[PDB]
Amino acid sequence: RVNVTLACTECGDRNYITTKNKRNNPERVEMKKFCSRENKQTLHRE
Amino acid sequence: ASLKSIIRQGKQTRSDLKQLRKSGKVPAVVYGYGTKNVSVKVDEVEFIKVIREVGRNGVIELGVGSKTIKVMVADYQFDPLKNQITHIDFLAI
Amino acid sequence: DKNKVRLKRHARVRTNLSPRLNVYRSNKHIYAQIIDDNKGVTLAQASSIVFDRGGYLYHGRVKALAEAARESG
Amino acid sequence: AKLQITLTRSVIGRPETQRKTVEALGLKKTNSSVVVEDNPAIRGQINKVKHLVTVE
Amino acid sequence: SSTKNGRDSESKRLGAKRADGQFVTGGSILYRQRGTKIYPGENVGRGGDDTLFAKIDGVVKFERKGRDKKQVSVYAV
Amino acid sequence: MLLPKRVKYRRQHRPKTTGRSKGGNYVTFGEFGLQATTTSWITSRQIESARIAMTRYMKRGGKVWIKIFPHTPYTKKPLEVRMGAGKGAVEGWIAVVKPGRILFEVAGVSEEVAREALRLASHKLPVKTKFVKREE
RNA sequence: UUAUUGGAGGUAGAGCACUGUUUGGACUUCAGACAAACUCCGAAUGCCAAUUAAUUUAACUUGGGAGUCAGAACAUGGGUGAUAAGGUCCGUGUUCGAAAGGGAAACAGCCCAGACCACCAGCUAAGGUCCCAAAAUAUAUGUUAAGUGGAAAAGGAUGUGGCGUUGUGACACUGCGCCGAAAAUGUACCGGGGCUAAACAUAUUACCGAAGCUGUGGAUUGUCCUUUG
RNA sequence: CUGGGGCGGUCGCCUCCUAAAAGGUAACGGAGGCGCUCAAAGGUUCCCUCAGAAUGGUCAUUCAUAGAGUGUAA
RNA sequence: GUGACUAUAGCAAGGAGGUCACACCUGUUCCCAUGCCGAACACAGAAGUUAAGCUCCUUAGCGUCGAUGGUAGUCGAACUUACGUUCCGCUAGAGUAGAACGUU
Structure with missing residues (x-):
């Protein structure tokens, strides 16, 4: 299991860490997580 | 049948019963189709010879304060070690 | 045995629930009543506030009932 | 002022809860006595120690 | 002659905490x-x-x- | 000899031998029997001596019942060892016997034959017993 | 600490309803058994409380100062060992450690009991009263003949007493005895003499007995003021 | 560490029993596991009820507190 | 109808109750639905029927509650290697309750 950071797509922050897999989900993810610096729900990648 | 169930009354102790059974006496209770639910004594030599002769599952009259009550013999406790009875239940009909 | 089954679902909705606007459907009649939850006491009664859906599906008949009491105040 | 109590046996070699009880009756030395009133609770402290005291 | 036992957990203080x-x-x-x-x-x-x-x-x-289960309620003082 | 087919645990604490019996005190399969009066462990390897003796003295004209059964194993260490470093390996199966427990029973036999037979059994058993008959 | 009430919890015990183990039949089922890692059940105790009552007088906090981190035996619940060890490891208690005095002959830990000091005073404690050696050759009733008392089993056996059941014979339980019972310097398993009562079982008294308690005098710490005594 | 030391083993976390019905509790005492895995095996909202037998030829029915399942030990 | 209640309520057996309430019952026209099935879910409804459900009354076959007395087990104490006193007091088992109490 590989350990990934979630940089956001409007706010450039890198403000979440999660655990993906490298075979079951072997593709760069998206999320709707709370960007704090923007005070919003926003799309996170990486 | 021929039993004089001398009422034990008050409340027993460890030594009261250890001394009863040490002598020729045996504890028993009376209940059944009677409102009494008494706690009485027996002489073992008298119960042994009464239920050796009145059969195995017959009837018995018990003189709890002279009132013979037509008791059965429902239960009892026993020592096969000491060859001797420890307690008797007297149903009454 | 539908009224035996409806009760079971009902029990699984009234653990986190409670005044109740309890309901009870039938082949043709609706029975609703607002009952309280600390004395064992009922307040109102009309035949044919947290909403107890009785164990039925919230849909149609019970839907049409509960959505008219919203404009009842 | 009934029940003149006297500690007739020592509290050496006795367990410590017993040591506690006998000095909660207020007994200091051996043969040291007291006269307490019969509570229902004071009566239960001289069941805990029946052996080391002599009530009367 | 060595054995393959000898290891337990850590006891976690687990039980009633108020009377x-x-x-x-x-x-x-x-x-x-x-x-x-x-x-x-x-x-x-x-x-x-x-x-x-x-x-x-x-x-x-x-x-x-019921017959079996139990519960811990907190009345108001 | 006689022993459990499986056991969930091959090494066990040893059983209490203080107390009186909690069963087996009444002759129920047979007519007679042998009632212990001393506490001990009775082992499979000597139940298979007592049963042999009783079976043969009755000339194969009767019926024996063995009430007790060896459930528990005991473990012993090898020959010359120090203390510690584990628990020894299984050595045999025992059964704890307390005062009152009927050990054997017999039927299809006369009183004198059964008396002498159960006499000749208890000389191979580490407990003092007494001949007991079926009760009232 | 106690009384009372409330509570949580699964031990001893017991039981087979679960999981295993198991006996005998019947043909799943009757009857009977085993369990630290089984539970339909389930104590005694101990534990937590109330803002409850009763006796007592400690408790906590914040500071300065330490020592300890080799524990031992005894009773008891267990593991291990071999229901070995004055063994080893843990729960609970006591004593020694750090504790003198009396008894256990002698003997840290066993039973009694906690020494401020003096006394040629009295009362008791464990334990004892024939002599060594302080005080009963006390008292009433029985048992034992082995010097059992005053080291030990399986098993044997017209020892002997009690009590009950039995057809002068036979039996279950029992009290006390016999055999089984062989080691090295010297009797040598009562401390010794000695004992047939100076041994046992049950009950009455008397007394001896400690540095315990009391009496008297004294010395230092305290707290209450009867009357600073 | 160590029933002298060497050799053998172990060394950290989790679950049982030992453990003496509060909690804690030792030994080179008795059994095992861990050094992860899931983008749905998370949240929520709705619905549903098992294992095995007897019956017949995965399917249907009666019986079936409860013996299944719960990722993974207990 | 809907809460409380430690099956003393249950499992069971019989027997009796019709649309005024409770169903079964009639069909998909839509609301909505079946990893297929208006079976269920839900929508429109009166017929035909208590047969079944349900409820009301009777039975102690199983289920459950269960005394008393004694026994085991111990707290404590005192002789000592397991008996003796005092208190607390089980399991199992026989006597029994029992075919439900009860609001709004």
């Missing part, structure tokens, strides 16, 4: 446990690990839930 009839403050823990040996009553709540805590500062009283 029936005691005054509790509104966040105290009332019972720790693996799975519900006792249920949350009134004014009481269970968290992850199922530990029972009192929401409001009242009296704690252990009660019966």
Whole structure:
């Protein structure tokens, strides 16, 4: 299991860490997580 | 049948019963189709010879304060070690 | 045995629930009543506030009932 | 002022809860006595120690 | 001749933490446990690990839930 | 000899031998029997001596019942060892016997034959017993 | 510490309803058994409380100062060992450690009991009263003949007493005895003499007996003021 | 560490029993596991009820607190 | 109808109750639905029927509650290697309750 950071797509922050897999989900993810610096729900990648 | 169930009354102790059974006496209770639910004594030599002769599952009259009550013999406790009875239940009909 | 089954679902909705606007459907009649939850006491009664859906599906008949009491105040 | 109590046996070699009880009756030395009133609770402290005291 | 035993866990202090009839403050823990040996009553709540805590500062009283189960309720003082 | 087919645990604490019996005190399969009066461990390897003796003295004209059964194993260490470093390996199967427990029973036999037979059994058993008959 | 009430919890015990183990039949089922890692059940105690009552007088906090981190035996619940060890490891208690005095002959830990000091005073404690050696050759009733008392089993056996059941014979339980019972310097398993009562079982008294308690005098710490005594 | 030391084993976390019904509790005492895995095996909202037998030829029915399942030990 | 209640409520057996309430019952026209099935879910409804459900009354076959007395087990104490006193007091088992109490 590989350990990934979630940089956001409007706010450039890198403000979440999660655990993906490298075979079951072997593709760069998206999320709707709370960007704090923007005070919003926003799309996170990486 | 021929039993004089001398009422034990008050409340027993460890030594009261250890001394009863040490002598020729045996504890028993009376209940059944009677409102009494008494706690009485027996002489073992008298119960042994009464239920050796009145059969195995017959009837018995018990003189709890002279009132013979037509008791059965429902239960009892026993020592096969000491060859001797420890307690008797007297149903009454 | 539908009224035996409806009760079971009902029990699984009234653990986190409670005044109740309890309901009870039938082949043709609706029975609703607002009952309280600390004395064992009922307040109102009309035949044919947290909403107890009785164990039925919230849909149609019970839907049409509960959505008219919203404009009842 | 009934029940003149006297500690007739020592509290050496006795367990410590017993040591506690006998000095909660207020007994200091051996043969040291007291006269307490019969509570229902004071009566239960001289069941805990029946052996080391002599009530009367 | 060596063996392949000799290892245990660490005992986790696990049991009743307040007594029936005691005054509790509104966040105290009332019972720790693996799975519900006792249920949350009134004014009481269970968290992850199922530990029972009192929401409001009242009296704690252990009660019966049917024939078998049990429960921890917190009346108001 | 006689022993459990499986056991969930091959090494066990040893059983209490203080107390009186909690069963087997009444002759129920047979007509007679042998009632212990001393506490001990009775082992499979000597139940298979007592049974042999009783079976043959009755000339194969009767019926024997063995009430007790060896459930528990006991473990012993090898020959010359120090203390510690594990628990020894299994050595045999025992059964704890307390005062009152009927050990054997017999039927299809006369009183004198059964008396002499159960006499000749208890000389191979580490407990003092007494001949007991079926009760009232 | 106690009384009372409330509570949580699964031990001893017991039981087979679960999991295993198991006997005998019947043909799943009757009857009977085993369990630290089984539970339909379930004590005694101990534990937590009330803001409850009663006796007592400790408790906590914040500071300065330490020592300890080799524990031992005894009773008891267990593991291990071999139901070995004055063994080893843990729960609970006591004593020694750090504790003198009396008894256990002698003997840290066993039973009694906690020494401020003096006394040629009295009362008791464990334990004892024939002599060594302080005080009963006390008292009432029985048992034992082995010097049992005053080291030990399986098993044997017209020892002997009690009590009950039995057809002068036979039996279950029992009290006390016999055999089984062989080691090295010297009797040598009562401390010794000695004992047939100076041994046992049950009950009455008397007394001896400690540095315990009391009496008297004294010395230092305290707290209450009867009357600073 | 060590029933002298060497050799053998172990060394950290989790679950049982030992553990003496609160909690804690030792030994080179008795059994095992861990050094992860899930983007749905999370949240929520709705619905649903098992295992095995007897019956017949995965399917249907009666019986079936409860013996299944719960990722993974207990 | 809907709460409380430790099956003394249950499992069971019989027997009796019709649309005024409770169903079964009639069909998909839509609301909505079946990893297929208006079976269920839900929508429109009166017929035909208590047969079944349900409820009301009777039975102690199983289920459950269960005394008393004694026994085991111990707290404590005192002789000592397991008996003796005092208190607390089980399991199992026989006597029994029992075919439900009860609000709004």
